Symmetry: D2
Subunit: 467 residues, 4 copies
C-alpha cells in the first residue's frame, strides 16, 4: 500500500546531521527507500526518468526526529479534557495515533519516539505505518511508564481536578487498564522477586524501549517541589537488569536532583526532562558526571515569551520549565552536555485548544507538529548553537535510542528520510519552519494534505449528522 521509493534531491546546501560545515551544490540519491549516494551535484548523474526535487537555493536536512511525544495526548490529560477525549474516540484510538503521527510528519518529523501511550493501539498503529498500510511518521514506543498510574489516577489529578468524581468507575477503570497494562502504582507494593517476572513479561510484549518512573508523577497534585522515589534501589535494580537483558534502550523519568543522579548512575540511555529537578539547581558534580559518562539528556524548555505568559497568569505549570529549571537548561547548554530534543507534545483536542488565550497558544511547547520548532528556538534563545540544536533534533535522538545506524543523518546506507527548507536554519533557527518538501524512505509526501482523515482535528463538531 506504501513503500520504499526512488528519488533524487538535487543541487542544495546539505546539512547532513553529522555537524560539519554545510556543503553546497549537493545531491542526495535515494533508491528503494535507502540512501545510495551523497555528493557533488555534478558527480552524481541522474537519469531524467527518475523523480527529482529541485533544491537549488535550498537547504537539505535529514528527516526530523522527535525524542519524546505522546500520540494519545498525555499532557492534556494532566488537566482538563481526558474524559471527553477518551470517550469521544473509544473504538478508534489507533486512528487517533495515526492522525497524530501524520501531524508530526506534516512538520517534517519522519521519526517519533513515543514515551507514554496505551500499548494496544500504539502497537496497532506503528505496525500499520511500518508496513505501509497507513501514513505517518514512523513510530517507536515505550508503551507505559513503569510504575506510573493511568490517566484517572492520582498521577493526573490536581487538587481541584478529579476526573473520577464525575465519570463512571467502569469507564475510568477500563481506561486506566489500557494505559497501565498491569505496570501501574501497585508495582511499588511488591518485593523484588515478584517484580522481576512482571517487568520481563511486559518487555516481551514488544516495546522498542522502556521508560521507568524513577521518581513520582504527582506534580499536578502536589506541585514541583515535593518529589518521591517510586521504587527501592533494589527493585529499581531488578527493573534495570531486565531492560538490559531484553536489550532495548532504557529511559528514565526524573523529577529531582537525586532522581537525576540515580538515573545517571544506572547509565540511562536517555533521561527525560533531566533538568526538571524540584526547582533546585543542578550541582556541578552532576554536570561533570554527564560529561564524563557522555549520557544523553532530553530537556523540555519554554521560550522567553511562553514562560513570560505563564508567569504572568501564575500558571500551575510555570515551574515545569521556568525559574531554576530554565537556569539548569542554560548551564547544561553552556557546559556542552549531550542533548536530545523532546517535548511531551500531543495532538491536542480542538475543544481544549479553543479554550486557550493567545498567550497560551503562542509558542506552546506541547502542540504537536510545531513543538520541535519551538524547542529549537527556545534552546537557541538560551545560547544553544543553531547547528547543535538541529543535531538535537536529528542525529542525537537517533543515537540515544540506538537507531543511528538507520536514521537521523544523511549518509549512504541509511533510510531515505529528508526534508528541504527554503531558508537557512543556521542563519535563523526559526527558518526550520520554511519546509518545502518532505520525503520518507524516498517517497515524497503531500505534507500539506495531512492528516488524511481528520479525526480529533475534525472541526467544528456538528451535533446531528444526517447521513
Amino acid at each position: 500500500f506504501f513503500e520504499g521509493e526512488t528519488i533524487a534531491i538535487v543541487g542544495g546546501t546539505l546539512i547532513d546531521g553529522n555537524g560539519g560545515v554545510p556543503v553546497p551544490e549537493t545531491t542526495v540519491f535515494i533508491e528503494d527507500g535507502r540512501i545510495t549516494k551523497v555528493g557533488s551535484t555534478d558527480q552524481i548523474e541522474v537519469h531524467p526518468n527518475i523523480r527529482q526535487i529541485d533544491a537549488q537555493g535550498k537547504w537539505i536536512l535529514p528527516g526530523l526526529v522527535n525524542g519524546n511525544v505522546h500520540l494519545l495526548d498525555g499532557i492534556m490529560m494532566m488537566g482538563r479534557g481526558g474524559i471527553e477525549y477518551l470517550a469521544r474516540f473509544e473504538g478508534n484510538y489507533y486512528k487517533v495515533i495515526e492522525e497524530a503521527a501524520q501531524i508530526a510528519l506534516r512538520g517534517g518529523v519522519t521519526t517519533v519516539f513515543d514515551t507514554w501511550n496505551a500499548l494496544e493501539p500504539v502497537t496497532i498503529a506503528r505496525d500499520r505505518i511500518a508496513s505501509g498500510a497507513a501514513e505517518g511518521a514512523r513510530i517507536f514506543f515505550a508503551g507505559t511508564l513503569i510504575g506510573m498510574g493511568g490517566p484517572f489516577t492520582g498521577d493526573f489529578m490536581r487538587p481541584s481536578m478529579q476526573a473520577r468524581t464525575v465519570m463512571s468507575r467502569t469507564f475510568a477503570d477500563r481506561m486506566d487498564a489500557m494505559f497501565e497494562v498491569g505496570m501501574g502504582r501497585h508495582l511499588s507494593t511488591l518485593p523484588p522477586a515478584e517484580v522481576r517476572p512482571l517487568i520481563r513479561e511486559y518487555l516481551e510484549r514488544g516495546v522498542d524501549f522502556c521508560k521507568i518512573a524513577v521518581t513520582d508523577h504527582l506534580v499536578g497534585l502536589l506541585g514541583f517541589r515535593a518529589p518521591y522515589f517510586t521504587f527501592s534501589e533494589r527493585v529499581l535494580d531488578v527493573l534495570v537488569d531486565e531492560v538490559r537483558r531484553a536489550g532495548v534502550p532504557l529511559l528514565t523519568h526524573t523529577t529531582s536532583l537525586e532522581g537525576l543522579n540515580t538515573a545517571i548512575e544506572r547509565d540511562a540511555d536517555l533521561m527525560i526532562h533531566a533538568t526538571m529537578t524540584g526547582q533546585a539547581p543542578i550541582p556541578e558534580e552532576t554536570i561533570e558526571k554527564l560529561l564524563e559518562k557522555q549520557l544523553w539528556s532530553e530537556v523540555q524548555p519554554t521560550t522567553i515569551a511562553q514562560q513570560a505568559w505563564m508567569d504572568s497568569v501564575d500558571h500551575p505549570f510555570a515551574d515545569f520549565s521556568g525559574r531554576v529549571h530554565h537556569e539548569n537548561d542554560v548551564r547544561m547548554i553552556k557546559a556542552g552536555v549531550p542533548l536530545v530534543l523532546g517535548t511531551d507534545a500531543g495532538c491536542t483536542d480542538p475543544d481544549i485548544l479553543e479554550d486557550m488565550s493567545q498567550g497560551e497558544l503562542h509558542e506552546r511547547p506541547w502542540t504537536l507538529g510545531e513543538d520541535h520548532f519551538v524547542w529549537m528556538q527556545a534552546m537557541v534563545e538560551k545560547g544553544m548553537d543553531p547547528m547543535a540544536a538541529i543535531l538535537a533534533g536529528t542525529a542525537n535522538p537517533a543515537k540515544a535510542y540506538r537507531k543511528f545506524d538507520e536514521l537521523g543523518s544523511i549518509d549512504v546506507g541509511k533510510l531515505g528520510d529528508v526534508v528541504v527548507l527554503d531558508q537557512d536554519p543556521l542563519a535563523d533557527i526559526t527558518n526550520m519552519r520554511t519546509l518545502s518538501h518532505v520525503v520518507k524512505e524516498g517517497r515524497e509526501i503531500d505534507f500539506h494534505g495531512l492528516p488524511l482523515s481528520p479525526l480529533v482535528t475534525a472541526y467544528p463538531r456538528t451535533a446531528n449528522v444526517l447521513d
Copy 2:
C-alpha cells in the same frame, strides 16, 4: 417508509382505558392506522386475508403512555456520566433519542412525553418517527425547562461533582447551549418586558408543550430542603400568559409546598413531581384545591424495595421519593386526586449501569423501558387501585396533554395503538410486564428486536475497531 396499517385483535378481554368493567370476548378492528370497530368477537366479522392477532385468553389494553421521560438521559447527568455520554454520542444525538424511543416501545409504550431534552435533536427525532422514517414510540416534547441551566451548570452539580472543573469550557458551553437554547438561568435577571419576547420566540420554535421551572433545580447541590422560586410572580405571569397565547399545554416543575400552590393557582395542565415538596407534608387545603380544580399531578414514586435500598446506603436521592414524599404519594392516592404516570426515566449509559449494585438496579425508577411497570407497582403498593394505575399510564397523560381525542384509549376513531398481555393486570399489576404483542397505528411491532441499531446500548465497548 412506515405507516398506518390494518389489523384485528380478536377475542380477548378488553380494558379500554375509560375505567369501566373489562369486557370479555372482544375484538378490536383497526384500519389504516385508526380504530374502526370495537365489539363482541362474534359480531365483528373479519375476512381471513386480514392480519390478525389471537387474543384468546388474553388482555387487550391501549398503547401505553409515559407522561415524563428524557430521551437524552437527564437523571444520569445529575450525577456521573454527563461528559462521557455527551462526548461519545456528539453527532448522533437524534439517533440516541430514537434508540431510547424504541426502548420505550419495547416496553409497550406507544407514546412518550419528553419533558427535558435538547430542542434540535428531539425535533429531528420526533419528525422522523412521526413521518415513518424511523422506528419508535411517538414523541411529544417541551424542549427545555424554562429558567433552568444546562447540564454543565449549577443545576446538575453536586458538592463533590463539578464537571466543569475537568472538561473544556468550549465543550461545556456548546452542550449547555443546545439544551438551554437561550432560556437558561439568565432569564431570572431580566424585567418582564424583556422576558416576553424571549418566551414568545421560544414557543414559536415548535414545541408540543412548555415546562416552566417554577422552583429551582439545585437538589443536587443543596439537597431537597432549601428550595427557591426561579421567577417573580409578575414574570411568571408573563410566561404563563405567553404559553396560553401559544395554545400549548403548560407544565410545571415544583419542589416545594409553595411552589406546588403557585402551580395550582396557575391552573397548570400537568404538574411534574407534584409530591416533591421540600420534605414537608402537603397540607389538606392543597389537596382540596387539586380535587376542586381537578388538575393533573404527575408523581414519581419509589417501590418499597428500591427505597429501602436507598435508605440503607444513605443515598443522596433518598429524599426524592422517600420519607415525607412517600407519605404525600399515599395521601394523594387515598384522596383520589387525578394522577399521571411519569418517571424522569432515560436510557442510561451501560458504563454507568455497570457501576451499580444489585440493589440500585432492582426496581430502579429511572430505567427507561421498565420504569412504567415499576411506577404502577409502586403506586399499587401504596394503595392505588390497579385500574386507576392503568389509567394513569394510558388515558390520564393523554388528557393532561390534550391528546385524548387521538390516543390513550381504545375507542372508535382514535389511533390504533394497542398492547396485548398474557395475564391479568387487574389481578396483579406486575402482570403488566406479560407483553405478547405491541401494535402502533395498526402495525404490529417486532418489539423483541428493538432497538434496531444499538448505539448507547451497544456493549461491550471495544477500544480499537479494525474495519
Copy 3:
C-alpha cells in the same frame, strides 16, 4: 461606668447634616449627652470650667453613621477564614463585637447598623455599650437575615470552598444555629400559616429592625447572574405584615431587578445593595418609582482603583460592584434618588488580611473603620456631590432607620455625637479622614487608643503563652 456628658465645640465651620450651606464661626454646646445650643461662636457663652474643644480653622460634623456593617465579619465568612475565626473566638463573641464597634468609633462612626450577626452576642454587646458598661459605637441590629442559611451553609460556600468538608459537623451545626436562630433556609419549605408564628416569635426576641432575604444569597456558589426568590409572594406578605405589626423598620436583601422591584412594592424602609441586580441594568421605571415613593436605597460601591485591581486579577467578587452595577450606581446618583451609606464591612482577621496583596487592601470596601471614607470617595468619583455623600453617611441612615429624632444631625435636642475634621470635606471628600476629635453623647473619645483590648486585632499570635 460611661455616660452622657458636657462639652463645647468652639469656633468651627458647621456642617450640620441638614444639607444647607456650612456656617462658619459656630459653636456647639452639649450638656448631659444632649445638644442644647448651636449658634455663632460669640453669642454662645461658655464658662472656662467647662470642657472644650477648639475647632478654630476646622470643620464640625455630626457623629458619622454606617447603615450596614457586620460586627462578626460576614464578608470574610463568604471566603476563607470562617472556621479559624469562629473557633478561635468561641466564648468571646460579644467582645469581638465590642472591639469591632470600637474600631468603627475610631473612624468617627458613633452609630452602626448591623444587618447580619448572631443574635445572642450582638444583643449582649449592644446592651453593654448602650448602658455604658463597654466602649464603642452604639449598635442597632437585625440579628439574622430571614431565610438565609448560616456560615457553614450553601449561602457561604464557593465551588472550591466547602468548609463542612473539613470541620466537625457538631461545630458547624452549633455555629449555624447561633446565626440562623431557627430562621434559616427551612423557612422556604413551609406554608404561610406555619411561617407566621416563627417570624412573630423572632421579632419578639428584641431586634431593632428586620432584614428579609427577598432573593437568594448564593453569589459565592453560583456567581452574580443566576438569582432566585427565597419566598413566594404570599409568604413574603406574611413576613412583611409581621414586621409592620412589630413596628420596626423593614430591610431587604435583593440581588436582581425583580427583587428590587418587589422590595420597592413593599415600601421597604431600607434596601440593601439595591444596585446589585444580576448584572442587568436598572430600568428607568424603577428609578422613577424610587423618586416617586422616596424610598431609601443603600448601595455598596467600589472605587476606581479597587475595581481595577479586582478586574485585573479576575476576582470572583468583581461583579459585586463592577461593570453594570457600577453604571447603576452612576445613574442612581445622577437621578438624585435617596441614598444611604453602607458597606457590609467587618473587622477582618489579621491572618486573612495578611494573605492579601497591596492591590486587594488598597481601598478595600470591607475594612471596618475606613470603609465609610472609601464609600464616600467612591461615590464622589461617580459624580456624587460631596455634601450629598456626607448626608448619605450621617442624616440619611438615621432617617431610613427612623432614628433621625435622636441622631444623624447637629440640632438642638439631639444626641451629642460630633466629629471634628482638620480639613474641608466639601473641597475634597478624602478630607473626611482628617479626624481630630471624636465625641459621643458629649463625651470626648481617646479614639487613637481604640480598641481598648485587642482581641481579633491582637497580633502577632504567639504559639505558647507562658502565664
Copy 4:
C-alpha cells in the same frame, strides 16, 4: 514542685515485666522515687509511718508504657478538625500536650513516646513534667517526622478534604512551620551534602529520638496501595549516619514491603506500623530477618469489632489495619518477632468525637487513655499470649527506646512506676482495665481526678462567657 517519693505496695501477685511466672504474696518497696526492694511480703518489713498500698488479692505491674502517641492529635488532623482545633488552642499548645499526658496517666501509662508533634510545645511540656512543675506521664519525643509535610500539606489531605482551600494561607503556613521546623517535603529536593547540616542542626535542638519518613505519608490522598520512598538511599544514609552520630534511637515510618526491608537493613531501633505494607503480605525472608537481627517492630492493630465496623461502612482507613495487614499481624505474633505496643493515639477534640457513631467509638484504636487496653485486647484476639502483650506494653518499648535501665519493669534500682489491678490480666486481658492504683516515682496519683485542668476536654462549649 513534684518529687520522687516513698511508698510500699504490699502483698500482691507480682507481674514484673521480665516475663517470668508471676510471684504471689509479693511486696515492692520504693524509696525516693527508686525501687529499693522486691520480695516476699513477710521478708520485707515496712514501718507503719510509711505510705502503703494494700495489694492483697490484686496484681502488681510496672508502670504502663506507650510506644507511639501524639499529644497534639495527629490522627484527627488526617481528616476533619485540624483547623478548628489548632485555631482554638493557639497560645496553649503546651497545656494541650500536658492534658493529653495526664489522660495517658489516667489509664496507668507512666511513660509515653511521642512520635510526631510540634517541637516547641512538646519540649516545653516534657521539661515541665520531667522537672515536676506539671503533672502527667513522662514524655520522650521525636519532634517531627523527617521528610513529612505539616498538617496543611498533602500529607494530611484527602481528595475531598483540603483544608488550605478554606483557611488563611498565613495561618496554614504558621502551623506547618511549627510542625515541620525546616524538615518538611523540601528535603526530598536536596543533594546529600545540603541535607547533612540540616539534619545535624535539627538533632541538636534536643530530641530524644528521631523518626524518618522512609516511605511517604499520602495514604489519605492516594489510599494504602501506592507507596513511595521519600529519599534516595544515599540521602537516607546521610540521615541515618547523623542520627547515629547524635546517639539517639532511630525510628522509621514505613508503609510498604520494600520500606520495611529498607528499615530492617538500617537496623532501626523501632519500626513504626511495621505491618502496614501496602496491603501486600510480608514475605517469610523478612520475618526471618526480624528474628535473626532481633529488631523491634511496633504494630497498630484493630479489634475484630472495630474492624468489622470499619468494613461495614467502607471506611477509608479500613486498610490501615485490616485485610492483609491483619494477617501480617497474625503471622508476626505467631512467629514470635519482637513486638512493641503503640497506637498513634491522641486526645481527640470533643466536637469531633461528638460526630462519631457508637460503632466508630467502640474500641476506637486512637482514643488516648484506653488505646493501650484496646491494643492488648486486639493482639490477644489474634493469638498473642497475654503475658507477651503485657510486655509489649511495658518492657519492650523501654528496650527499643534504650530506657530499660530506668523503666519498663519492676526491678531494684529502676524508677518507682507501678500500677495495681483488681483482676488477673493473665486470665483475661481486658482485666488490664481494672486499675485500682497508679504510682509514678513512688508517688501515688489521684488518677480519677485527671486531667487537672480540662482544656480540649472541657465540654460543652459556651458561646459567650460572662466573667
